[PDB]
C-alpha cells in the first residue's frame, strides 16, 4: 500500500473521558457477571490438583 | 490513454530530444551565435585586477 507517500487519517489515541467511564463501567459489569456465574457453578470441583512434579532438567532429580 | 507524465512517454520524448530535435536546434544556435559574435566584435590594487572591497546580521553582536 502507498501509506508512506499518501498517509491516511490518523487513529487518535487521545482517550475521551466519555469512553473511559463507559470503558470502566463495562469492566465492572463484566467482573460482576463472572462472580455471579461462578456462584451458579454447575461444574465439579475437586480437592487435589494436578501437580506437574519436578522438572526433568533439574540436575538433582 | 497514457498520461503526459507517463514514464514511457518521457522515454520516447527523451529519444526525440536527442536524435531529432537536438541536431536541428544545435545548428540553429550556431547560426544565431555567429550573428551575435559579429555584432559584439564590431599593480593589482591600482588596476582592479586584485579584487578588493567596494567603496540584520548573521552573528550575535559581541
Amino acid at each position: 500500500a502507498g501509506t508512506i507517500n499518501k498517509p491516511k487519517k490518523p487513529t487518535s489515541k487521545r482517550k475521551t473521558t466519555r469512553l473511559r467511564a463507559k470503558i470502566s463501567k463495562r469492566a465492572a459489569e463484566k467482573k460482576r457477571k463472572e462472580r455471579k456465574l461462578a456462584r451458579k457453578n454447575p461444574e465439579w470441583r475437586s480437592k487435589l490438583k494436578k501437580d506437574p512434579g519436578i522438572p526433568n532438567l533439574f540436575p538433582y532429580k | 490513454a497514457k498520461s503526459a507524465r507517463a514514464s514511457r512517454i518521457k522515454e520516447n520524448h527523451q529519444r526525440f530530444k536527442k536524435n531529432i530535435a537536438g541536431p536541428v536546434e544545435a545548428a540553429r544556435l550556431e547560426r544565431l551565435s555567429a550573428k551575435l559574435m559579429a555584432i559584439a566584435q564590431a599593480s593589482g590594487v591600482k588596476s582592479g585586477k586584485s579584487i578588493g572591497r567596494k567603496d540584520s546580521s548573521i552573528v550575535f553582536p559581541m
Binding site: - | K17, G22, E25, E30, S33, L36, G48, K49, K54
Partner: protein, 356 residues
C-alpha cells in the same frame, strides 16, 4: 475554473517577468535568451502546408498571425548572480557609460521637472581613471558568479507610441564559461541588438505579457458558471500569463520595402495594413510574425523568450512556406492590398480630375 491561477489579482507590474530562463550548460555557444517587442495587431496569411500525415498536406491553409514590432534593443549593462543556500543573489551590476535619455526616463517619475543627473557620477567612474573600479566589478563577476545577465532597453522613439519611457529587463547569457560571457556582455555595451540575431524563422518561442483587463466582473464571466474554491466577483483580466509553443513564421527587416512580399506574389508591400494598424499605427522596424494569438492588448510591451526544453513535436523544426500576406484594411471590410490596387479597380474619381 482552474486553481492553478487562483489569486486572480492584477499583475504587480505592467511588463511581466520571465521567471525562468532555460537551463545553462557551458558546452553551447554564447547566446542571448529573451527580447522585447510591442504588439501591433493581427493579420491573415496563406501557408503552403508540408505536414506529412495531415489532411491538409500539400495544400494551402489560411491562418491567423500576430505582428510584434521589434526595434533593436540597446545593451547598457551587465549583472552577475551567485548561488546561495537561500537561492540566487545579485552580487554586483556593471552599467555602461553614455546611457540614453529614454532609459534614464525609466528611473524618474517626473522627468520634465527634474535636473537630469542619473548616472552622472557613474559616468565619471569610467572617464576619470576609476576604470579600475569598473574592471574590479568585471573581475568580481568572472571569479564568483555562475549566471550573468544583460540589461537591454527598447527604443520607443522608433515605435509609433506616445510613451517616451523605455523598458528595461535582464536577459540571461547562456552557453559558455562565466569568463567568456562576461567578455561577451562588455563587448555588447552601447550597441544595438536586432531581433533576427536573438531569434530566427520557423522556431517556436514563448511570450510573456499581461492580459487585457476587464475590471470588476461577476461569476458568470469571471469563473465561467453555467470559500477559496467558490466562484466570486472581483478582478478579471490584467493577469500575468506565460504562453508557450508559438511558432515564428517570419522576421521582417523593415528596410526591405517588400516585407509582405513572398516568392509566390510579386507585390512590393510592407506589413502595415492599408490605412495603418488599427489603434496602433505603422510598423517601421523589424517585426516578428507569430502564429496564432498572444496575450496582451495592442501597443502593449511584449516579452519574448526561448523554449525552456528541447521540443518534442514535428511542429517545431518544420519549414514555414508563405504564399500571400494580407495587407487590406482592418478598419472595415477591406478588399485592397495596396493604394494602387484600389485606384486601378475604381478608375479615376471626381477629385482626381479636379486636382489634376
Amino acid at each position: 475554473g482552474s486553481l492553478a491561477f487562483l489569486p486572480r489579482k492584477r499583475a504587480a507590474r505592467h511588463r511581466g517577468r520571465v521567471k525562468s530562463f532555460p537551463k545553462d550548460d557551458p558546452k553551447k555557444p554564447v547566446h542571448l535568451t529573451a527580447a522585447m517587442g510591442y504588439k501591433a495587431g493581427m493579420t491573415t496569411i496563406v501557408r503552403d502546408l508540408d505536414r506529412p500525415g495531415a489532411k491538409a498536406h500539400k495544400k494551402e491553409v489560411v491562418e491567423a498571425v500576430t505582428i510584434i514590432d521589434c526595434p533593436p534593443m540597446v545593451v547598457v549593462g551587465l549583472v552577475g548572480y551567485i548561488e546561495t543556500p537561500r537561492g540566487l543573489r545579485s552580487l554586483t551590476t556593471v552599467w555602461a557609460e553614455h546611457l540614453s535619455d529614454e532609459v534614464k526616463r525609466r528611473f524618474y517619475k517626473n522627468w520634465y521637472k527634474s535636473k537630469k543627473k542619473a548616472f552622472t557620477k557613474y559616468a565619471k567612474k569610467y572617464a576619470e581613471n576609476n576604470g579600475a573600479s569598473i574592471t574590479r566589478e568585471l573581475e568580481r563577476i568572472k571569479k564568483y558568479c555562475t549566471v550573468v545577465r544583460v540589461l537591454a532597453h527598447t527604443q520607443i522613439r522608433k515605435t509609433p507610441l506616445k510613451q517616451k519611457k523605455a523598458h528595461l529587463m535582464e536577459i540571461q547569457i547562456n552557453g559558455g564559461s562565466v569568463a567568456d560571457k562576461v567578455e561577451f556582455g562588455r563587448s555588447l555595451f552601447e550597441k544595438p541588438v536586432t531581433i533576427d540575431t536573438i531569434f530566427e524563422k520557423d522556431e517556436m518561442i514563448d511570450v510573456i505579457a499581461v492580459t487585457k483587463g476587464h475590471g470588476f466582473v461577476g461569476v458568470t464571466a469571471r469563473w465561467g458558471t453555467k470559500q477559496w474554491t467558490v466562484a466570486r466577483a472581483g478582478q478579471m483580466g490584467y493577469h500575468h500569463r506565460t504562453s508557450v509553443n508559438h511558432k515564428i513564421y517570419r522576421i521582417g527587416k523593415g528596410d526591405d520595402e517588400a516585407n509582405a512580399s513572398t516568392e509566390t506574389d510579386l507585390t512590393k508591400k510592407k506589413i502595415t495594413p492599408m490605412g495603418g494598424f488599427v489603434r496602433y499605427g505603422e510598423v517601421n522596424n523589424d517585426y516578428v510574425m507569430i502564429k496564432g494569438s498572444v496575450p496582451g492588448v495592442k501597443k502593449r510591451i511584449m516579452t519574448l523568450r526561448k523554449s525552456l526544453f528541447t521540443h518534442t513535436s514535428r511542429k517545431a523544426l518544420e519549414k514555414v512556406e508563405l504564399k500571400w500576406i494580407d495587407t487590406s484594411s482592418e478598419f472595415g471590410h477591406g478588399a485592397f492590398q495596396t493604394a494602387a490596387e484600389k485606384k486601378q479597380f475604381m478608375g479615376t474619381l471626381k477629385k482626381d480630375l479636379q486636382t489634376s
